[PDB]
Amino acid sequence: TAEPDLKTALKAVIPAKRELFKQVKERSDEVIGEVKVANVIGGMRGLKSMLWEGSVLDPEEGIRFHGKTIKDCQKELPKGTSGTEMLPEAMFWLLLTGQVPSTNQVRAFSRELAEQSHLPQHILDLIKSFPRSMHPMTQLSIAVAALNTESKFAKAYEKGLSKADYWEPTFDDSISLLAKIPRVAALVFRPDEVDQVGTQALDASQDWSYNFAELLGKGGKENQDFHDLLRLYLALHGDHEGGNVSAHATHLVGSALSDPFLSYSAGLLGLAGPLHALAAQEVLRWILAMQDKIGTKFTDDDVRNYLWDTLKSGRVVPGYGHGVLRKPDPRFQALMDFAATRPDVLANPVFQLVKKNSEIAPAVLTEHGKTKNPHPNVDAASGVLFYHYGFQQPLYYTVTFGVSRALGPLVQLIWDRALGLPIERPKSINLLGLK
Amino acid sequence: GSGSTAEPDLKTALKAVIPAKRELFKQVKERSDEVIGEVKVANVIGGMRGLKSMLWEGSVLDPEEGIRFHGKTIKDCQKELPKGTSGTEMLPEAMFWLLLTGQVPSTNQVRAFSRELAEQSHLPQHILDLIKSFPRSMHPMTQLSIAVAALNTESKFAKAYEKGLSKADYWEPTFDDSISLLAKIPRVAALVFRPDEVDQVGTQALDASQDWSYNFAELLGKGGKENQDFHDLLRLYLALHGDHEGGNVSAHATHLVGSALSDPFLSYSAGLLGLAGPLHALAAQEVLRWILAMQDKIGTKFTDDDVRNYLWDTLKSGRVVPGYGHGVLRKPDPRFQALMDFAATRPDVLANPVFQLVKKNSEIAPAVLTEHGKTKNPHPNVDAASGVLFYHYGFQQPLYYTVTFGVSRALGPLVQLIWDRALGLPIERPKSINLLGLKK
Structure with missing residues (x-):
């Protein structure tokens, strides 16, 4: 009678993905592209050279998540108990499993996110050491990295863990990071209220975005329209292929078996880059x-x-x-x-x-x-x-983007570990070598 | 000396070689359409292994002679690069000079560069406070990454970019930040090594006439003439591990994050987060x-x-x-x-x-x-x-051997970051695909 939780639903779809991976691997020698000088000097632009499962850009219809358009997601994904907009937690479910969750599955996942949101005291102390003028994205990156003290993956890897099981601790750390990151972001937004916002209990019957709004000082019924905006914003920005710097840096650092806290910290450091983040x-x-x-x-x-x-x-x-x-x-x-x-x-x-x-x-x-x-x-x-x-x-608009953009890269990190993808290690060359 | 022919500092020596590199880049760009390899399914699912897809100027792996720095072998470097005032081993500062400029510095140029590094070795108070907040069980490489990122409060590049800066000038604040990071990183690493002595190690005055490795050793508690052999080992270690092409995760992650115009503090922090991965770090x-x-x-x-x-x-x-x-x-x-x-x-x-x-x-x-x-x-x-x-x-x-590697591996990636900005290299942005798209 009880519906599968997210970890159970993920476990059920791992064997099919490993089988599809095995079929693709048999075609390893097949050629799909050319590398040109342009690609080496041009930041790999247009070079189709990494795996990303959850999202593919359609040149006509835009970003699709497991084949679904934004409109399909808005129709199919569960909403909050109030409001008109799809939930980012539901989008995470879809990205991870390839499946649309039931409303009840989403409600149970929201309750998990609320309950895992608290921060260790050393993170609160770390945040209080930041000067007021430290850039908000620097604060966010650092705090997320510092949560690696709580990494189940790092500890399980050190103890000894089968390759086939790397995904479980990775998943647990990803959910932990997701639960915590809105609270870290709110502490960046409200540096004078570390003690209060840093320890405030979240309403376990409300959704991730609502509780983020509450931590930002925009809770309650008067802000219901903002709740819907935030839900939509966070769902829409969750993933956009693997090529963008935040997704790619997460994958890259992840591929050396750094845990999700360190890996998404690297993602955030890339997101801090002014060139496209502003x-x-x-x-x-x-x-x-x-x-x-x-x-x-x-x-x-x-x-x-x-x-x-x-x-x-x-x-x-x-x-x-x-x-x-x-x-x-x-x-x-x-x-x-x-x-x-x-x-x-x-x-x-x-x-x-x-x-x-x-x-x-x-x-x-x-x-x-x-x-x-x-x-x-x-x-x-x-x-x-x-x-x-x-x-x-x-x-602070980048901070909110950083919260959203945890969703897709963490999903891919889980799949990278489930499939056993190796370290990302391209080959470099000097200009004289191209001449 | 302040004459007509007074020996250039590192920034001047770099400026002198920028035009020739930009000209070589222009020539390479005319060959943009030339095909240099294939992409296979193996490359997509195998972490881009063997895919020649990024630029790295300072070091190239020779299948016979091993890693070479601007064509120079390790033996050539050991003979040609200036040493400390005592000791038999090449200086990491001299290796940095070579990687950056393509040229062997004079002993006097190295001495002046070492003095610049010693003069910038102090840390802001908030970095010391940050380090004191770390739980004793926090992994040393997590500590090191975080502290390096936190130094972005001191970034000249970040501030200059925000204010408005010509593209042709991006390299200068990048260089200033890179030198600042280099000067500071041994002190940060020593604080990681000695968590009970943050106040003392964190503020201790360094001898500005000593070289970078010596000062690092001093901050580690291994200074003085009794440790002179260790000083030479550390010099050699730091010089040897400075750079090894662009493909390794620390070099690559630095370049990747740097390519979005994050400053060198944030970019090398990302490098260190990758270095923290146990798979090949240990x-x-x-x-x-x-x-x-x-x-x-x-x-x-x-x-x-x-x-x-x-x-x-x-x-x-x-x-x-x-x-x-x-x-x-x-x-x-x-x-x-x-x-x-x-x-x-x-x-x-x-x-x-x-x-x-x-x-x-x-x-x-x-x-x-x-x-x-x-x-x-x-x-x-x-x-x-x-x-x-x-x-x-x-x-x-x-x-803690990884921490010392993290100090060494600042050298090459920071050089490449400076060159990335001097050349105007764009954001690194490959294209992804899903398994279904490879099955077709």
Whole structure:
């Protein structure tokens, strides 16, 4: 009568994945690609060279999770007891097992996450040692690494553990990290309340995102719309193939058999890189500057003129353009669907500007001709939506992304260990060697 | 000296060689479309093994001569690189100079660089407080990674990037941060080694006229003239382990995180998190345990046959001879030989039975392993000797051998990070696929 818990459901699908892996391994010698000089000097761009199970980017329909579109996930995944949005814990279930959980399975997993959320005293002390001006992503990376004192994998490996069993402690550590990371993030957000936020008991009947909101100081019925935003945000950003730096660094460090705490810490150190991590922040700044210029009662024409002027000036429209995706990011559209049912969001001029830009900017960018596949990505909307709900320190938008992006890389780490994938170790060459 | 021809500092010497590297990069870029290999299913499921897919300037593994630094063998480095004011071994500071610039520094340039490192060796108070928060059982490599990441509060690159900085200038703050990290890391490592003395070791003033290894030894509690042989071992160890191509996890993770424009503190922290992985990090420790177990079994007065018999029994049992074997290198690791050359001038090392056993194994094990036929290129690597040499000098907590490797392995990856920024290399971003996509 009792439904399988997540560990049982994972164990049931391990044999089929190992069988599929065995079939692929028989074709080891088969050639699938070429390596060119471009790939070596160009950061391996386009080189199909690592495994990632849970998500694959479809050039038309965007990111798919085990073949499911964002829309399929929004229809199929269990929701909270209140609210309209899919749960990140349900997305984690799907990523890990390939299967949609029942509502009751999700409720039991949420209860586990709440119960495992507490931090050891040394983590609270560690966090209190950080200077106030330490960058929030540096704080988050360090704290996550420091939780390796609690690693079951590290201890089991040292004691002696069969290869075939490496996945179990990896799974236990991953759930532990997931339970804890929202609380660590909230301590980064509220450095003066370490003692209180660091020990506060979570409501075991509520979902992971709700409890994260509570730790952020945005709990209770008055913040229910924000709860739904946060649920959606965390679900949407959970995984996006293995190539991005946070996913890849997690896998890389993981592949040397560093435990999930150390491995996702490395992921977060990569996420701290300014080059692509600040897109949501940049979009927000750009939208607010546009509002400053064109005011709060603006026409379609005003928007179009503003976009042309930006482009003619040699500036970019942030949050637009992609190497391969030929349509709007379905993650973007999911945020727009969230907004469409909330009259106060639709009344916000900042949001209206995001919406108008999404209707006008792609045609403008195409005609201008400089930007490949000029459609909105998720960063076009996420910052503005957080800003609307009072979360107006953009610097911390990366922290919330770091919480979300634990989901997919941890799933892949579990599978890496289940399948027995080896250390990641490419071969380097010097420029003289390419000449 | 402040003349017309006054000897360049490291940053000036680097600046002088940047234009030629950018020109060589331009020439390589014209060949972008040239095919240099194949990708197979093996490469995707096998952690990219053998896939030539990243750039690393400073070191290239030669199948005959072993690891070379800008074409120079370990023997060339031992002859050409400047030594300490006392001592017979090449300085890791000089190795760093060579890796970075492609050039052998003068003794005077090395002395000035050592002084810069000594002057920057102090830590901010919050780093000492952070280290004091660590539980005593926290793994030493977790401690080291965290403390290095926490030094990003001092990053010039992070602050300059945020303020606005030309792409052509990214290398300068990267260089400044890298030197800062190098100066500080031995002190951080010593705090990991001595958790009861954080306040003292953490603030102790260093002799600014001493070299980087000497100051590290001093912070470890092994300073003074009585430890001069250990100083030379440590110099050699740190110089030898500084760089070994880009593929190893510490080098690669540094480059990967660095490629998203995270500063050198955050990037080498990621390197150290990878170094903390037990799978391939613990070889020096395994060799030490194996040698000591062998000595236990065969004693100190043994025949060549006894050694051979011990090796055959190990192999027939299905166990490995650690510290032996390589995929590509067809001779003893030249790093191994450099450790043996160190030993050859120290009569107390040569008198140590544990060292004699390392030497005897290197003369007997290769033939045995070849005949057994299971281990490719069955020659000793550097791990065959490093742990025993430390053990001889009283550095007998093998768990901490990885920490000393972490200090050494700052050198090469930081150099490559500086070059990545000088060249404007993009984010590392390969493409993934699922098993279903390989089954088709």
